[PDB]
Coordinates of C-alpha atoms in Angstrom, one line a residue:
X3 CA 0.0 0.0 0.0
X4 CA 1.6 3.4 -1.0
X5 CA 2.9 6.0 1.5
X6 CA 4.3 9.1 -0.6
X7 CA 4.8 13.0 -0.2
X8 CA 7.1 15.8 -2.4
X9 CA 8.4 18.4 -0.4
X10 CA 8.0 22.0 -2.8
X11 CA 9.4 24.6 -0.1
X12 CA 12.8 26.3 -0.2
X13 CA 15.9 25.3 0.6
X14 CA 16.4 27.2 4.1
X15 CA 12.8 25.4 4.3
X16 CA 13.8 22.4 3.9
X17 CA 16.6 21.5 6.5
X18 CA 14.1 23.3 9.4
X19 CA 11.6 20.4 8.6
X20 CA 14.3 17.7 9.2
X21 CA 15.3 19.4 12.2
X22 CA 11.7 19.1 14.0
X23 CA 11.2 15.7 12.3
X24 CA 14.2 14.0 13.9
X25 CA 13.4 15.5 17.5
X26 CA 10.1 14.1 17.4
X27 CA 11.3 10.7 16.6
X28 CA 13.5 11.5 19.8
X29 CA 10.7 11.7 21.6
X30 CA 8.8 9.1 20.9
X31 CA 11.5 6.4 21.1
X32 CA 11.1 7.8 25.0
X33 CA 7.4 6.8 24.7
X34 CA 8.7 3.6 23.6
X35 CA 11.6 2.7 25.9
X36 CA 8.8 3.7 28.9
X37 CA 6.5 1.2 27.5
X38 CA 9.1 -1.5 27.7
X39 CA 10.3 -1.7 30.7
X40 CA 6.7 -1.2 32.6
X41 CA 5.8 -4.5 31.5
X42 CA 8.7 -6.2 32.3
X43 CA 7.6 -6.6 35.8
X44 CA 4.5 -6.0 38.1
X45 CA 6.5 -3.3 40.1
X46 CA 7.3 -1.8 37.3
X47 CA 4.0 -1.6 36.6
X48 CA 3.4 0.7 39.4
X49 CA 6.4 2.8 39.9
X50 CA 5.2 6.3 40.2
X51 CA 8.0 8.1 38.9
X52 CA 8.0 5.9 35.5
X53 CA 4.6 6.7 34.4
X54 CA 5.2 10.4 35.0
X55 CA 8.5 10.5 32.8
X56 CA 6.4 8.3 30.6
X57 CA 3.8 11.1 29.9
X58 CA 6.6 13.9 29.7
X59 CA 7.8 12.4 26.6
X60 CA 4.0 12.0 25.0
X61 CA 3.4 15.8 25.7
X62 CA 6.8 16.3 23.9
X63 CA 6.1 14.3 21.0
X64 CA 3.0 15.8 20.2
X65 CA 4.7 19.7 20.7
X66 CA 7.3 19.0 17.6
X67 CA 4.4 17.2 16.1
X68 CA 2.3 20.9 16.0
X69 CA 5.6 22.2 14.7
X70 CA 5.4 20.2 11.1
X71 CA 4.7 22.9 8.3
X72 CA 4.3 26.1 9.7
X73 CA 3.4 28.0 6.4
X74 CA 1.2 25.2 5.2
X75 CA 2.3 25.0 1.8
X76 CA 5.8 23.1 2.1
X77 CA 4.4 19.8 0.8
X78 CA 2.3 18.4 -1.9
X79 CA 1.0 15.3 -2.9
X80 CA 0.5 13.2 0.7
X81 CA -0.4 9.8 0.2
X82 CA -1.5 7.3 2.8
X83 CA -2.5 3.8 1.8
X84 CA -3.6 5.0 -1.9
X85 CA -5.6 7.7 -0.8
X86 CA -4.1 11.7 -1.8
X87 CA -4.4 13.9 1.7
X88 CA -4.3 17.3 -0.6
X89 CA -7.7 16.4 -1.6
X90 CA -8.8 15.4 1.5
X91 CA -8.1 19.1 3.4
X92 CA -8.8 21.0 0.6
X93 CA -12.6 20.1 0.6
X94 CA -12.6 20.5 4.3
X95 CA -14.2 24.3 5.5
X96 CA -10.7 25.6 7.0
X97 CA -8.2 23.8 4.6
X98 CA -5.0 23.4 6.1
X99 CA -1.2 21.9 6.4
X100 CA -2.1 18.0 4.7
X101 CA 1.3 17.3 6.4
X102 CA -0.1 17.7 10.1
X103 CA -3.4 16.0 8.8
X104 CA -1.2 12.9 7.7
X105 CA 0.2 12.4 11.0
X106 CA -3.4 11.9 12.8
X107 CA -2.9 8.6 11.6
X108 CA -1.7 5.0 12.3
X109 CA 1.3 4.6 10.2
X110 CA 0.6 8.2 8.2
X111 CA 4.5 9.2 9.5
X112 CA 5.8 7.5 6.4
X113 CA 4.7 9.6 4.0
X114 CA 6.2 13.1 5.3
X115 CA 9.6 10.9 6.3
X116 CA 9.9 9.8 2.4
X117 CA 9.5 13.0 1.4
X118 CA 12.5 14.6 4.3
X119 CA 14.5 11.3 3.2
X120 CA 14.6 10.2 6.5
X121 CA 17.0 7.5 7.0
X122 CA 19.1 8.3 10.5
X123 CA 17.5 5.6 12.4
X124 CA 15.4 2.3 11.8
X125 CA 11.7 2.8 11.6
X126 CA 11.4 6.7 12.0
X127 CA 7.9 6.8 13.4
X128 CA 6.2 9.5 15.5
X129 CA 2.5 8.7 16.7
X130 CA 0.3 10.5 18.4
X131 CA -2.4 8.1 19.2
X132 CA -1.7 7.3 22.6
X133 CA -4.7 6.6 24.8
X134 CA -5.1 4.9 28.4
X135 CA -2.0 6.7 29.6
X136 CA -2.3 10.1 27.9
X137 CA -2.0 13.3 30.9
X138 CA -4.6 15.5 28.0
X139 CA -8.1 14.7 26.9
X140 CA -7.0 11.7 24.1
X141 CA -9.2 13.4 21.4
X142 CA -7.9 16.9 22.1
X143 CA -4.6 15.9 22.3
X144 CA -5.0 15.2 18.1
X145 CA -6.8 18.0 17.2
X146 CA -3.7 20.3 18.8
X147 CA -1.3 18.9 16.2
X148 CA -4.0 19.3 13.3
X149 CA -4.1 22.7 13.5
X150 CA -0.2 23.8 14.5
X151 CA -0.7 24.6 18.2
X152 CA 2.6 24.9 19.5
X153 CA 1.6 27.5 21.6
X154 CA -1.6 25.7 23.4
X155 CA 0.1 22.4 23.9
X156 CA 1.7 22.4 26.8
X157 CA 5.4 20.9 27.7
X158 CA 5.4 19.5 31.2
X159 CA 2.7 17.2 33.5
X160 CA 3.2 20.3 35.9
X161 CA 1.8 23.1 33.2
X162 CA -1.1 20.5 32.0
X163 CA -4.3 22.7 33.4
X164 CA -7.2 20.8 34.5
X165 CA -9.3 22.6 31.7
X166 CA -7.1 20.2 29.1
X167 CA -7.3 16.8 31.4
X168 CA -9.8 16.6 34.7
X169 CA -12.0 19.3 33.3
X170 CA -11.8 19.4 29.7
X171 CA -15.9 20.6 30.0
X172 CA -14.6 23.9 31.1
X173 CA -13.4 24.9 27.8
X174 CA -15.9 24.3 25.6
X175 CA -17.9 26.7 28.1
X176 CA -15.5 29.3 28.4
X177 CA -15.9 29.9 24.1
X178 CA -19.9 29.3 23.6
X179 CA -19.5 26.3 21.4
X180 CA -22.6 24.8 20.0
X181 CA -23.0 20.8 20.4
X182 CA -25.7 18.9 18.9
X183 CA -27.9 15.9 20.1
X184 CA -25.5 12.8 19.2
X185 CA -22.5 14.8 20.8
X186 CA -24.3 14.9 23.9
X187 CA -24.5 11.4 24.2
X188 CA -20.9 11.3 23.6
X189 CA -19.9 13.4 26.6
X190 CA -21.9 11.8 28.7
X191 CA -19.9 8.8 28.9
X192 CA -16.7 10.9 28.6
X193 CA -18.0 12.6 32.2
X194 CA -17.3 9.4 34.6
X195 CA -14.4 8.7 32.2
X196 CA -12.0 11.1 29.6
X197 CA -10.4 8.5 28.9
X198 CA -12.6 6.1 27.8
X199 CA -11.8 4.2 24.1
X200 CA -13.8 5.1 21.3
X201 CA -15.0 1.5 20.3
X202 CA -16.0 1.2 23.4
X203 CA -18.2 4.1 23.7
X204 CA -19.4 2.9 20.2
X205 CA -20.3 -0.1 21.5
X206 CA -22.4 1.3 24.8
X207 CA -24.1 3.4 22.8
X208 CA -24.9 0.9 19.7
X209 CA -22.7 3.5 17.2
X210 CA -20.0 2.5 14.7
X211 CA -17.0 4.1 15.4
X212 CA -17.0 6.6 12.8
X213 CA -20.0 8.2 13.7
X214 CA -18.4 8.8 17.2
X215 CA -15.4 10.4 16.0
X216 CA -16.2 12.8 13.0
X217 CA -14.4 15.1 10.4
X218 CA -11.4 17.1 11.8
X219 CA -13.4 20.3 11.4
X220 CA -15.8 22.4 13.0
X221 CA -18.3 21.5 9.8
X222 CA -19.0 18.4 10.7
X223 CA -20.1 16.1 13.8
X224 CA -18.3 14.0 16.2
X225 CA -15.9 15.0 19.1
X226 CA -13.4 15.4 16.5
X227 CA -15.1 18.3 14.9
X228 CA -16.6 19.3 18.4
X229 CA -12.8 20.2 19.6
X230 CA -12.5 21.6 16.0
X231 CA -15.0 24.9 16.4
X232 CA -13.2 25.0 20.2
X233 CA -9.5 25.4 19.0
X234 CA -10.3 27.6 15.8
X235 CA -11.7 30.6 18.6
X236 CA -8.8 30.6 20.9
X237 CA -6.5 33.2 19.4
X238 CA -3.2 32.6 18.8
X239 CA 0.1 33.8 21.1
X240 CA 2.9 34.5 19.8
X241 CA 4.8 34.8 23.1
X242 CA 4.2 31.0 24.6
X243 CA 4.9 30.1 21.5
X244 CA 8.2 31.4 21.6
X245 CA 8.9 30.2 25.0
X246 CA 8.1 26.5 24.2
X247 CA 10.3 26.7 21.6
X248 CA 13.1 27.5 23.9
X249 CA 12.1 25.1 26.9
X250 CA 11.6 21.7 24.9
X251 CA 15.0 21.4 23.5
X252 CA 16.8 21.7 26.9
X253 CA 13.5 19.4 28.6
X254 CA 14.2 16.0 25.9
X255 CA 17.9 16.0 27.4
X256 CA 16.3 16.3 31.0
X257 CA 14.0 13.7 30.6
X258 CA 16.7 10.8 28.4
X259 CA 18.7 11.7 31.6
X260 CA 16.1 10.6 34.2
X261 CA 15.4 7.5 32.3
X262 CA 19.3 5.9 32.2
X263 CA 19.0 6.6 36.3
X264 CA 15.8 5.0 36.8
X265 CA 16.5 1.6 34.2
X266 CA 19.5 0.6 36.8
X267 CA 16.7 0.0 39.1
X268 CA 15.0 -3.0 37.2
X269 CA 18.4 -3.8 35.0
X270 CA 21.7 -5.0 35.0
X271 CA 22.1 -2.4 31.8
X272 CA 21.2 0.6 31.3
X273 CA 18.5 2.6 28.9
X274 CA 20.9 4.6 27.6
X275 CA 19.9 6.9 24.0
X276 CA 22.3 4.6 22.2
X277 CA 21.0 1.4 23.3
X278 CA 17.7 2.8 22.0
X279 CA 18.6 3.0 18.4
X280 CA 20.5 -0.1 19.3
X281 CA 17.8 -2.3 20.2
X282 CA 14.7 -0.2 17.8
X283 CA 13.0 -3.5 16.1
X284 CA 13.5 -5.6 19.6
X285 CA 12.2 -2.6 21.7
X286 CA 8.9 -2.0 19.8
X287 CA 7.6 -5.1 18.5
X288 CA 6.7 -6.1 22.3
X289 CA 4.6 -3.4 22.4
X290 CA 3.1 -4.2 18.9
X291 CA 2.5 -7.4 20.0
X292 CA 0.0 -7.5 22.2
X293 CA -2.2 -4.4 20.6
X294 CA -2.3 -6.4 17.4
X295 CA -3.4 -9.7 19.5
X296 CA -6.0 -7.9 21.5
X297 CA -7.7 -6.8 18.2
X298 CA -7.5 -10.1 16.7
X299 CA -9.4 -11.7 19.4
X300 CA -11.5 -8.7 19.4
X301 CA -12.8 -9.3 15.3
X302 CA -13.3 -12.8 16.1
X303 CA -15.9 -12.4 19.5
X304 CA -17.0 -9.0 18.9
X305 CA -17.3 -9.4 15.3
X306 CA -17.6 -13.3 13.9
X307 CA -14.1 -13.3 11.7
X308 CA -12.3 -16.2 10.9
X309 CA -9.1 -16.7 13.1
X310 CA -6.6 -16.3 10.0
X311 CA -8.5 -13.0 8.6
X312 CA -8.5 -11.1 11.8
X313 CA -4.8 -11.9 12.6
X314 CA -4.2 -10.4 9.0
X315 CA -6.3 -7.3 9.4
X316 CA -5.0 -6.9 12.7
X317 CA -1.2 -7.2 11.7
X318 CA -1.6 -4.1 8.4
X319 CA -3.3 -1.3 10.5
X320 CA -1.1 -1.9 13.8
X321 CA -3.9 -3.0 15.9
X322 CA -6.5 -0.2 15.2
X323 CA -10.2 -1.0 14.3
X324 CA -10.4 2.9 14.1
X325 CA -8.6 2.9 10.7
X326 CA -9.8 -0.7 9.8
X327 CA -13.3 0.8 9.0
X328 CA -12.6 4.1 7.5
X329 CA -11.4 1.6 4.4
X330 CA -12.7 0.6 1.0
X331 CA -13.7 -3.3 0.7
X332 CA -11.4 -3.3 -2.4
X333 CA -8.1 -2.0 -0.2
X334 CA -9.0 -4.5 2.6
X335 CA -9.2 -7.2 0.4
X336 CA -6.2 -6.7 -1.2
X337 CA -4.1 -7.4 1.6
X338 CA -6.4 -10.0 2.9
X339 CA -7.7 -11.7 -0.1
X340 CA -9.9 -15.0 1.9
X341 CA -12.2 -11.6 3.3
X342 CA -15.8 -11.8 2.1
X343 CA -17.8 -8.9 1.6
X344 CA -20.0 -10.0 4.5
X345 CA -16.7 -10.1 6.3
X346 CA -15.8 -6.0 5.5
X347 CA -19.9 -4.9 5.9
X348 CA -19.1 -6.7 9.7
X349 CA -16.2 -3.9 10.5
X350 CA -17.3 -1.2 8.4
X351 CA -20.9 -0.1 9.0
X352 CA -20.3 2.9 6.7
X353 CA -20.1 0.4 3.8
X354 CA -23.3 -1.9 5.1
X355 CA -25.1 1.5 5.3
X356 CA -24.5 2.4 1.4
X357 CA -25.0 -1.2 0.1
X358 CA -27.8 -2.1 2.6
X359 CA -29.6 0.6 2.9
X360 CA -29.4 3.0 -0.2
X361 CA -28.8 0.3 -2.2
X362 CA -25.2 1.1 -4.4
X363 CA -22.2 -1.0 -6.1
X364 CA -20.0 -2.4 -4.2
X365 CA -17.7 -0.1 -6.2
X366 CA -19.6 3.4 -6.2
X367 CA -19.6 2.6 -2.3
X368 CA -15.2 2.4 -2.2
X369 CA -15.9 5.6 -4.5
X370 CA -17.5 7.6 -1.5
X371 CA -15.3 6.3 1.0
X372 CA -12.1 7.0 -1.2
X373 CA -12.8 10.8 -2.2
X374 CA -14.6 11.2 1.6
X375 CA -13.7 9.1 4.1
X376 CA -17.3 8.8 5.9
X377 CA -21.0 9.5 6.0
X378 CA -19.5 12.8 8.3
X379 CA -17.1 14.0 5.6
X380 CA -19.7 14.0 3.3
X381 CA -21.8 15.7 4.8
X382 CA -19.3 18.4 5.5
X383 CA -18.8 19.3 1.5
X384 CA -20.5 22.2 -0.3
X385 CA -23.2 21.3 -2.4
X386 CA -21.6 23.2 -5.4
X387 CA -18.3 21.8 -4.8
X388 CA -19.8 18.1 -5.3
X389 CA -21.1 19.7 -8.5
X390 CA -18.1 21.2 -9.8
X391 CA -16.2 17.9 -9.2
X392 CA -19.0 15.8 -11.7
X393 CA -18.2 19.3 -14.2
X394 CA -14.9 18.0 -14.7
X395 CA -16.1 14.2 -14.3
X396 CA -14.2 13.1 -10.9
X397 CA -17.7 11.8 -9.5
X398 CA -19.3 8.7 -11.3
X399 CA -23.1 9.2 -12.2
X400 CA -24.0 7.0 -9.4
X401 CA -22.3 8.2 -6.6
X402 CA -22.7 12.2 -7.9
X403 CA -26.9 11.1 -7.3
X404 CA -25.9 9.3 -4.5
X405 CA -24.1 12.3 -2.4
X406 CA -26.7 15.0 -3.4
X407 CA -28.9 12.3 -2.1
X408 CA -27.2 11.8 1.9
X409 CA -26.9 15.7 1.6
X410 CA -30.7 16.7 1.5
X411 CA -31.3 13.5 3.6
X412 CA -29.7 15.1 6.7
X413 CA -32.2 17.8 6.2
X414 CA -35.6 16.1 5.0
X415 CA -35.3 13.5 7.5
X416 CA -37.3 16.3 9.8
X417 CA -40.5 17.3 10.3
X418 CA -41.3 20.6 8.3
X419 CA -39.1 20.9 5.8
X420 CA -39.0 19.8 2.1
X421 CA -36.7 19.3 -1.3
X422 CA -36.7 22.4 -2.1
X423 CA -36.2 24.6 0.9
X424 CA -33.5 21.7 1.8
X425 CA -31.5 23.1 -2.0
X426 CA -31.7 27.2 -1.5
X427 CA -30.2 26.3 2.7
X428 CA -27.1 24.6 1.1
X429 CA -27.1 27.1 -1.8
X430 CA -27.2 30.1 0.6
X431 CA -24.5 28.9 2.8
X432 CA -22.8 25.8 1.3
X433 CA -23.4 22.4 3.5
X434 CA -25.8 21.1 5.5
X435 CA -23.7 21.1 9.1
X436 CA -23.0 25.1 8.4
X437 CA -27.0 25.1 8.3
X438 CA -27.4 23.2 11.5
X439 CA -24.4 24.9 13.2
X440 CA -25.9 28.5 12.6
X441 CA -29.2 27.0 14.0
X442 CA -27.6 26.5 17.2
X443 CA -26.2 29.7 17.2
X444 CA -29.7 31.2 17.1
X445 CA -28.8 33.6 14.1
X446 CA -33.1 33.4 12.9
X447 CA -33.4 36.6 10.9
X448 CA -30.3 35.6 8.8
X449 CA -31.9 32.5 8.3
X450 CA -35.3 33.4 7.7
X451 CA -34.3 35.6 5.1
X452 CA -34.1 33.2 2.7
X453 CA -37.1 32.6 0.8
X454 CA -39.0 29.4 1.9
X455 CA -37.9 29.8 5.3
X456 CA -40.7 30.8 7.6
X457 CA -42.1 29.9 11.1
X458 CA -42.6 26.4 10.3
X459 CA -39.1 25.6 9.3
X460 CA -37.7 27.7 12.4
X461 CA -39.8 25.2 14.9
X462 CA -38.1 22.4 13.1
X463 CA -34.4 23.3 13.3
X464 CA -33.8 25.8 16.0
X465 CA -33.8 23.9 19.9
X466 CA -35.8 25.5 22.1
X467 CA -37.1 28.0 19.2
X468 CA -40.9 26.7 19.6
X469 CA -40.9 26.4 22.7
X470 CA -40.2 30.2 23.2
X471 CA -42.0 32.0 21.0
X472 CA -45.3 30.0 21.4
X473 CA -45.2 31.8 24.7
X474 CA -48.1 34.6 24.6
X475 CA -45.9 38.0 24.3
X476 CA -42.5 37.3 23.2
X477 CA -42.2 37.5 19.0
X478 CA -39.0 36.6 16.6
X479 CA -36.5 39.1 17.3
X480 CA -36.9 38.4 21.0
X481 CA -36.1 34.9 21.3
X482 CA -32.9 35.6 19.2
X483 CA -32.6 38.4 22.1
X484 CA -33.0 36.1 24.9
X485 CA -31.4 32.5 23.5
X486 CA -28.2 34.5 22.9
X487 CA -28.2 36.4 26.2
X488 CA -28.2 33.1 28.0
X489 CA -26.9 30.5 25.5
X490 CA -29.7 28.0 24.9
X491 CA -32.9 27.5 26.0
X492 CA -33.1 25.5 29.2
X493 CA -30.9 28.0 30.2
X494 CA -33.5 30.5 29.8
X495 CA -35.7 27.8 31.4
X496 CA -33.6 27.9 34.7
X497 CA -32.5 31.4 34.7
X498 CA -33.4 33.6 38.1
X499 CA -36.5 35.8 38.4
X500 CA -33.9 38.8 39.2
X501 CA -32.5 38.7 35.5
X502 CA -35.6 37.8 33.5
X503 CA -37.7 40.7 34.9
X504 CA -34.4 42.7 34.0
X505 CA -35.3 41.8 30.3
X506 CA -38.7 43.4 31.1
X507 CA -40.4 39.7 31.3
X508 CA -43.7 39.7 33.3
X509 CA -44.7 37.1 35.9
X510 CA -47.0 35.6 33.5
X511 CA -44.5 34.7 31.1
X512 CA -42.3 33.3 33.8
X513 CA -44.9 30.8 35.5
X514 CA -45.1 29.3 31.9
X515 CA -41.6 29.4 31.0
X516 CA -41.1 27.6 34.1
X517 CA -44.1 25.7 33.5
X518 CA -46.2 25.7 36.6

């Protein structure tokens, strides 16, 4: 499967990008080394010092990692597994560095290290996928390094706020982020536990995994694109920026120098940097290991795969059913050719959903998924973009029907509105989830004034909008007053007497809001 990038920038350009490359691989051989030698014994296991030294090189990993094309136009061409990134980001509402995108991935570090002709060491990876043992929020973590944030992610366990871990809730309230119904359910799990695995949530909550996690943008729906609208409003400083820069270099000397000292403890050698690149292959396939096995057994219990298939699904994506079902049945079954398409429908319900259900080709389906990725990143493409691609004849007649289809879909599967209405909303302003995001953000008179859109559709898409202005005495250009004031309407429905008789609200009004 091919792995590819070509690197356009200058040459001053192009030896800073090796620079921040290689460190990164510094750091997460330290990830690496940790992992080892905790599970080597059981007091290993639970040696406080090691799984704080362990985390200080995950935080520094992903810092370099938001450091990977500043000026988002150094690379071109990224390709990961067949599939070309540029594409992919270009579609999406904020664009982006496809370099930073490519590294979200299992494996997608091979593409950018082609591309830098990265040979210094065996196996030059840097991932940034690290769950049960991450100090941030998991899913936050990932969305730092999409969008460059050197200057938000921090460098030490002892800078990590609680607003980024403990209380990652906190943010999203300190910006006024909108979150819709599915979302919700999301975060309710997420409450007892951050750090809870996103099959697993998928699997409490009957959900493939895809439809948990969502586009890397705030256009689209998942807590992927939820962290998305956060990160876009923080504004960027330039000063932590600058002292990150400073602090990481001298902190990645600190911490290979606590880890020689500590191995003594539990070996007759030493950890030592050199060892390291030593011992790369030996050090790392222990951890492989045992991720690759417990998602083999997985796809047999959970899923009803022969043994030899799941070992060999298992073994090519490095243990993750995350990036097992965001692939086209013709890519799975060319590296595991005894897979039935019953087989790939049983891992990805994205496929089953297109073939079952709207009835497509097996190969219109891969189509979709190639150009796409997901129901979500569909759904997060202008309207007249889809068009303009079938113009030039990149969409097949079947699947050009078939998008324009899921597109309206998302907005005719309620109760007021129609075809056409659905058309001039995606016409006015592009997608569907720009439609739904703006009717959580309460903006009505920009949305009514688009012709078709009346009182009717307003009760169907804004929360809380019926319920407020079917109150005697409040009209239109109120609720938007009021929904905005407080943010949302239960808000409103809980607010104190004091403040809604401040907005000139009589007592009637209130018993009813209320509702006694």
């Amino acid at each position: 499967l091919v792995y590819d990038a070509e690197f356009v920038g200058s040459e001053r350009e192009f030896e800073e990008e090796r620079e921040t490359f290689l460190k990164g691989v510094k750091a997460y051989d330290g990830v690496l080394a940790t992992r080892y030698l905790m599970e080597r014994s059981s007091s290993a296991k639970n040696d406080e010092e090691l799984l704080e030294l362990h985390q200080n090189f995950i935080l520094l990993t992903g810092s370099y990692a938001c450091s990977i094309d500043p000026t988002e136009d150094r690379y071109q061409n990224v390709i990961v597994r067949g599939v070309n990134f540029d594409e992919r980001v270009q579609r999406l509402s904020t664009g982006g560095s496809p370099a930073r995108y490519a590294i979200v991935y299992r494996r997608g570090w091979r593409a950018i290290a082609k591309a830098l002709d990265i040979d210094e060491e065996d196996v030059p990876a840097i991932e940034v996928r690290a769950v049960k043992r991450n100090p941030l929020q998991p899913a936050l973590y990932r969305i730092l390094v999409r969008y460059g944030r050197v200057d938000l992610m921090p460098v030490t366990v002892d800078e990590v706020p609680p607003e980024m871990a403990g209380e990652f809730e906190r943010l999203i309230e300190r910006y006024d982020v909108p979150i819709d119904e599915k979302e919700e359910r999301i975060l309710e799990i997420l409450r007892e536990n951050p750090w809870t695995p996103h099959d697993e949530i998928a699997r409490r909550l009957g959900l493939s995994v895809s439809e948990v996690e969502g586009e890397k943008d705030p256009e689209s729906s998942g807590i992927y694109s939820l962290w998305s609208r956060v990160v876009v409003n923080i504004e960027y400083d330039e000063r932590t920026a600058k002292r990150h820069v400073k602090r990481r270099d001298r902190l990645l000397e600190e911490l290979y120098e606590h880890l020689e000292e500590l191995s003594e403890r539990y070996l007759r050698h030493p950890l030592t940097r050199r060892w390291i690149v030593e011992h790369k292959r030996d050090i790392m396939r222990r951890y492989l290991e045992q991720r690759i096995v417990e998602c083999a057994l997985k796809l047999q219990d959970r899923y009803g795969i022969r043994e030899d298939v799941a070992l060999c699904l298992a073994r090519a994506f490095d243990g993750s059913i995350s990036m097992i079902a965001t692939t086209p049945y013709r890519t799975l079954k060319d590296v595991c050719p005894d897979l039935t398409l019953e087989e790939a429908k049983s891992v990805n319900r994205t496929l089953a959903t297109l073939i079952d259900e709207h009835g497509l080709s097996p190969d219109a389906a891969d189509e979709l998924i190639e150009h796409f990725e997901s129901i979500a990143g569909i759904l997060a493409t202008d309207l007249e973009e889809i068009e303009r691609m079938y113009e030039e004849g990149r969409l097949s007649e079947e699947a050009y029907r078939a998008a324009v289809e899921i597109q309206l879909a998302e907005l005719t599967k309620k109760e007021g509105v129609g075809r056409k209405t659905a058309e001039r909303l995606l016409r006015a302003f592009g997608n569907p989830e720009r439609v739904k995001q703006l009717a959580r953000e309460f903006e009505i008179e920009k949305l009514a004034s688009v012709e078709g859109v009346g009182e009717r559709v307003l009760r169907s898409l804004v929360p809380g909008y019926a319920s407020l202005i079917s109150i005697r005495g409040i009209d239109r250009e109120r609720a938007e007053r009021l929904l905005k004031k407080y943010g949302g309407y239960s808000k409103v429905r809980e607010a104190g007497v004091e403040e809604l008789r401040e907005d000139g609200l009589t007592d009637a009004q209130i018993r009813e809001l209320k509702g006694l």
